[PDB]
Design a binder for this molecule. Structure first.
Ligand SMILES: *[C@@H]1O[C@H](CO)[C@@H](O[C@@H]2O[C@H](CO)[C@@H](O[C@@H]3O[C@H](CO[C@H]4O[C@H](CO)[C@@H](O)[C@H](O)[C@@H]4O)[C@@H](O)[C@H](O)[C@@H]3O)[C@H](O)[C@H]2NC(C)=O)[C@H](O)[C@H]1NC(C)=O
Ligand SMILES: *[C@@H]1O[C@H](CO)[C@@H](O)[C@H](O)[C@H]1NC(C)=O
Ligand SMILES: *[C@@H]1O[C@H](CO)[C@@H](O)[C@H](O)[C@H]1NC(C)=O
Ligand SMILES: *[C@H]1C=C[C@@H](O)[C@H](O)[C@H]1O
Ligand code: NA
Length: 497
């Protein structure tokens, strides 16, 4: 409905500029009439989900690339897409004037925006906090009598989550993850560094830590928020590393198996929160399938585990077939879910690169590859950061699809926002990945989904410089004659009857 106000910061593409009075917006998604397809196009040159429509043809002839829909070939159901309400994201959003805040929240959560349906919520402090704290910092409080939510939750994160839910037309799923326990439960007595829970699963330290999850869910429930899922720990492999710089809590896969079986599973199952899902791993996919084998081959752990959460940071070293593919083969009834991604965290990446088309392409390439290897959802990290990629108490600055500029009461929507939106806007919860096969070797990344109503959604990313003329065949409906420009992403929609 309202176009991008483009601005260049000297990188490969533009950001869209928003402020207290103006922000670019979309129409709520619709399917066009049977016999017609919709195309949403974003380009490096500056197009941002531009809508065009075309006819579906009964016949096709020629030697060009054909992508053939296999609609009766069914894969995974989609849970959804979203991002993380870190302390840093909440501070950046609340630093904007209230009208600018509302336009930022609408960008993510409204059907005039990109229709997010997942929010990941840290359990107390992480690196994307300005303060180090847990919910139970009073020493040796095994009863957790002094468990309480500080203002980071009650004043910042919880009220913003309520505002997001009010804007969302889709049901929103909250996902909780802890970085560190209270230091008095830890071998090293520090939020960071190499350190695990004291003792062993089934003991007072592990039972106290499991009860901390219930007290967290109780306190958010007093604030009228319910969780879809929790993870067993953010990046449990991190707390095994000498000198780890920020909040962590080390588990080997054996330690996670026994903690789930003895402490966390039984404690959640015997609580009012028994319907909250438990996701294991919440770490790099390089740890698969080994971690899944260690946990899920123990029936006493397996009965509590709903799914396996993965982070993208070693995907470049960890081929999808050998990790996700092999994990799905061995454990086809345990869903895979991508719970954290961001650009800028690696030694060779600058924190923030305003308007980077490359970083948008990284997001869409990741989402397509994950959907092609059975993953049911994909979750960004910080919803918003400042232009330094913070704040962050260890200055571990990264990039975000929205960058706030508080001086100018402005925020910038980057290519990453539009690349995520090509999926989140058009793929409701309960959509199913279906087959789509290419007639010849090609440089495109593509994925097909069947919308809950039976209609087709196809996303096509061209990470090459070369325009690729392309036909899509739906054997029931006909042929879509189209073109994939160099450095473009398209979403196609069409009804099937
Ligand atoms: C919040 O963001 C708004 C959108 O950026 C800001 O409004 C913009 O402010 C600038 C400065 O006054 C205006 O720029 C001038 O624009 C005209 C040409 O205008 C038209 O074409 C542009 C570009 O295609 C289009 O966006 C407009 O709709 C106009 O039809 C030039 O002749 C001037 O030399 C100068 O460049 C923009 O017109 C204006 N944009 C809009 C959409 O209103 C607003 O100032 C910001 N608010 C705050 C508080 O900072
Ligand atoms: C498509 O091909 C068939 C079979 O050769 C032909 O008879 C028909 O006229 C063509 N066009 C249609 C069905 O619109
Ligand atoms: C912890 O809670 C108990 C019981 O309600 C209270 O008596 C005590 O003063 C609290 N301690 C701190 C440090 O807040
Ligand atoms: C995911 C990547 C970077 C960190 O900011 C975050 O804490 C980690 O879990
Ligand atoms: Na970096």
């Amino acid at each position: 409905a309202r176009p991008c106000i483009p601005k260049s910061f000297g990188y490969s593409s533009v950001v869209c500029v928003c402020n207290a009075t103006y922000c670019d917006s979309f129409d709520p998604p619709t399917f066009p009439a049977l016999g017609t397809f919709s195309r949403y196009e974003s380009t490096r040159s500056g197009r941002r989900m531009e809508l065009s429509m075309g006819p579906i043809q009964a016949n096709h002839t020629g030697t060009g690339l054909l992508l053939t829909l296999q609609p009766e070939q069914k894969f995974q159901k989609v849970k959804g897409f979203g991002g993380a309400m870190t302390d840093a994201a909440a501070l950046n959003i609340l630093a904007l004037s209230p009208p600018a805040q509302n336009l930022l929240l609408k960008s993510y959560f409204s059907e005039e925006g990109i229709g997010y349906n997942i929010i990941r919520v840290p359990m107390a402090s992480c690196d994307f906090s300005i303060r180090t704290y847990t919910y139970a910092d009073t020493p040796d409080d095994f009863q957790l009598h002094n468990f309480s939510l500080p203002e980071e939750d009650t004043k910042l994160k919880i009220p913003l989550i309520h505002r997001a839910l009010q804007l969302a037309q889709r049901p929103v799923s909250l996902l909780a993850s802890p970085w560190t326990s209270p230091t008095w439960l830890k071998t090293n007595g520090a939020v960071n560094g190499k350190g695990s829970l004291k003792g062993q699963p089934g003991d007072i330290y592990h039972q106290t830590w499991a009860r901390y999850f219930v007290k967290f869910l109780d306190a958010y429930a007093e604030h009228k928020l319910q969780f879809w899922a929790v993870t067993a720990e953010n990046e449990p492999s991190a707390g095994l590393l000498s000198g780890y710089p920020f909040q962590c809590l080390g588990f080997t896969p054996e330690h996670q198996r026994d903690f789930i079986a003895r402490d966390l599973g039984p404690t959640l199952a015997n609580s009012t929160h028994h319907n909250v899902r438990l996701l294991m791993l919440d770490d790099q996919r390089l740890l698969l399938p080994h971690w899944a084998k260690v946990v899920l081959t123990d029936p006493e752990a397996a009965k509590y585990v709903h799914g396996i959460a993965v982070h993208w940071y070693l995907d470049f070293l960890a081929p999808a077939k050998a990790t996700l593919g092999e994990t799905h083969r061995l454990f086809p009834n345990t869903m895979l879910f991508a719970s954290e991604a961001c650009v800028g965290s690696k030694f060779w990446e600058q924190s923030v690169r305003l308007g980077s088309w490359d970083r948008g392409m990284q997001y869409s390439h990741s989402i397509i590859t994950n959907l092609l290897y059975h993953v049911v959802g994909w979750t960004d990290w910080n919803l918003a950061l400042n232009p330094e990629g913070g704040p962050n108490w260890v200055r571990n600055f990264v990039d975000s699809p929205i960058i706030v500029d508080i001086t100018k009461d402005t925020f910038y929507k980057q290519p990453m926002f539009y690349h995520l939106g090509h999926f989140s806007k058009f793929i409701p919860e309960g959509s199913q990945r279906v087959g789509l096969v290419a007639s010849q070797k090609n440089d495109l990344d593509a994925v097909a989904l069947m919308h809950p109503d039976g209609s087709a959604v196809v996303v096509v990313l061209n990470r090459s410089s070369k325009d690729v003329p392309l036909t899509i065949k739906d054997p029931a409906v006909g042929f879509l004659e189209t073109i994939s420009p160099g450095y473009s992403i398209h979403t196609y929609l069409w009804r099937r009857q």
